[PDB]
């Protein structure tokens, strides 16, 4: 299977530098173009740069020329984006993609994308509070419970339930930027009322920018 | 540069319908236009390349066509899982450029929300902030009004909402509203009420608790 | 300034779709009529009723 995997995105101060990698497998980047494409509210999907690793030819968007360089190491089947003199408008999800693979004249494979946050604020790990199921979160024989993941920066966090074995009825909400400048999100799951107390329910929270990994058990509050 | 102009910005249709979205190139791009689908938390996925050709694995209900500089994407029998953002892209001149996107939403029958409320956790109350969470589960359409009342006084400026994207199976939404107080304020008042107005409800639903009750 | 023109797409068989066009009032208007004419190719001649100073449109297709 063809696969591209970006890494290296994170929080970087204005004026600072960051280097992203794009690791390819299931094909050889010598046979295709490799592109970097970013996505942001300001510009939507926005082409950044491309390279033809067979001969080293590169091209850049005007807004990044001189501040970004693309390159590839065919020995490691990997492409790179060096990002210097970073600005607020560089904050974006950075994807890499291939073009021309198997003769397809389009971007037929993309990575999952790596997030770059250009900001002067500093990293902060979330507090993870349970949303305990109760008489006020149940009806029709089902009950809602969850986890509040409060006061983190930067994005992203990930939330799973019972190590990913619980997916049905899960709603993990989009984060909200609080006026403090810190993010917050909640994740809820709906389950049979009769399972409360016999089935263990744990939200697995990971905030990699602060090395924060939390497994919070959510149970009915006793009185 | 070549700009790609997509319309409409939002299109909402029933399951089984035929939907058409369009993309206009500011100058001749020949057939060098691709269409991508982007679903929640995913990267763009190639649907159509060179204006009219189905990428491998893509369902045959997707089709594309070209007339001069006008490019259309058609979904002949809309499925719930086609809920997504769609983007066209030209590769005829560098820089390759993308349209601004068309969002496709599924129309379905009205469903009133399940309304739940969560006091601040005892853990959170240990430090100095209180978060009260109101949950509207699995409703349609998206429009809803959540109002917070604290001891019957309408709250304003101290709540934030978040809405999930349309469910890929039942096409419903869920919504959370979070009211944020100081702990001192939270311990000062008694009745915490979330009031939900929604088309599926015969009249607004209030869900509430008294601070300190079990 | 930016406005949203809301449009009901009313097809001959009774099926209804809704769509939004955004931009300046003049851009959003032109896009709506352009889109109406495109769908008319396969759905039959259209007619467009305008409510609310033109910020909302009902567009029926003849089939």
């Amino acid at each position: 299977e063809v696969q591209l995997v970006e890494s290296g995105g994170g929080l970087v101060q204005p004026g600072g530098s960051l280097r992203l990698s794009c690791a390819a497998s299931g094909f050889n980047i010598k046979d295709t173009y490799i592109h970097w494409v970013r996505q942001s509210p300001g510009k939507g999907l926005e082409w950044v740069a491309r390279i033809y690793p067979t001969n080293g030819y590169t091209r850049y968007a005007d807004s990044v020329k001189g501040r970004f360089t693309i390159s590839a190491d065919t020995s490691k089947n990997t492409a790179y984006l060096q990002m210097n003199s970073l600005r607020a408008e560089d904050t974006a999800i950075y994807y890499c993609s291939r073009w021309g693979g198997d003769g397809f004249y389009a971007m037929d494979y993309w990575g999952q994308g790596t997030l770059v946050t250009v900001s002067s604020a500093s990293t902060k790990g979330p507090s993870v509070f349970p949303l305990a199921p109760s008489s006020k979160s149940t009806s029709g024989g089902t009950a809602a419970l969850g986890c509040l993941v409060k006061d983190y920066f930067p994005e992203p966090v990930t939330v799973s339930w019972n190590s990913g074995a619980l997916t049905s009825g899960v709603h993990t909400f989009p984060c909200v930027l609080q006026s403090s400048g810190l993010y917050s999100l909640s994740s809820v799951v709906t389950v049979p009322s009769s399972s409360l107390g016999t089935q263990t329910y744990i939200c697995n929270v990971n905030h990699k920018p602060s090395n924060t990994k939390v497994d919070k058990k959510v149970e009915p509050k006793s009185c | 540069d070549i700009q790609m102009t997509q319309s409409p910005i939002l299109l909402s249709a029933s399951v089984g319908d035929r939907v058409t979205i369009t993309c206009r190139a500011s100058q001749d791009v020949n057939t060098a236009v691709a269409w991508y689908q982007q679903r929640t938390n995913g990267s763009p996925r190639l649907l159509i390349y060179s204006a009219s050709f189905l990428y491998s694995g893509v369902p045959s209900r997707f089709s594309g066509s070209r007339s001069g500089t006008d490019f259309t994407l058609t979904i002949s029998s809309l499925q719930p899982e086609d809920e997504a953002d769609y983007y066209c892209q030209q590769h005829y001149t560098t820089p390759p450029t993308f349209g601004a996107g068309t969002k496709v939403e599924i129309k379905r029958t009205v469903a009133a929300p399940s309304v739940f409320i969560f006091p601040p956790s005892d853990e959170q109350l240990k430090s100095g902030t209180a978060s009260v969470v109101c949950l509207l589960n699995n409703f349609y359409p998206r429009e809803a009004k959540v109002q917070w009342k604290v001891d019957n006084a309408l709250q304003s400026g101290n709540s934030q909402e978040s809405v999930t994207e349309q469910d890929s199976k039942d096409s419903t939404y869920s919504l959370s509203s979070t009211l944020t107080l100081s702990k001192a304020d939270y311990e000062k008042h008694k009745v915490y009420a979330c009031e939900v107005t929604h088309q599926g409800l015969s009249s607004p639903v209030t869900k509430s608790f008294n601070r300190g009750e079990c | 300034s930016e406005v949203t023109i809301k449009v009901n797409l009313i097809f001959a068989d009774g099926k209804i779709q809704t769509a939004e066009f955004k931009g300046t009032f003049e851009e959003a208007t032109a896009e709506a009529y352009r889109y109406a004419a495109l769908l008319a190719k396969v759905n039959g001649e259209y007619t467009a009723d305008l409510e609310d100073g033109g910020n909302h449109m009902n567009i029926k297709f003849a089939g």
């Binding site: 994005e155 | 929640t40 995913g42 601004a100 969002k103 939403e105 994207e165 | -």
Partner: peptide, 12 residues
């Protein structure tokens, strides 16, 4: 309508 970082979708 523009892309939203938190929803990872075009807003509406």
């Amino acid at each position: 309508s523009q892309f939203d970082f938190c929803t990872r979708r075009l807003q509406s």
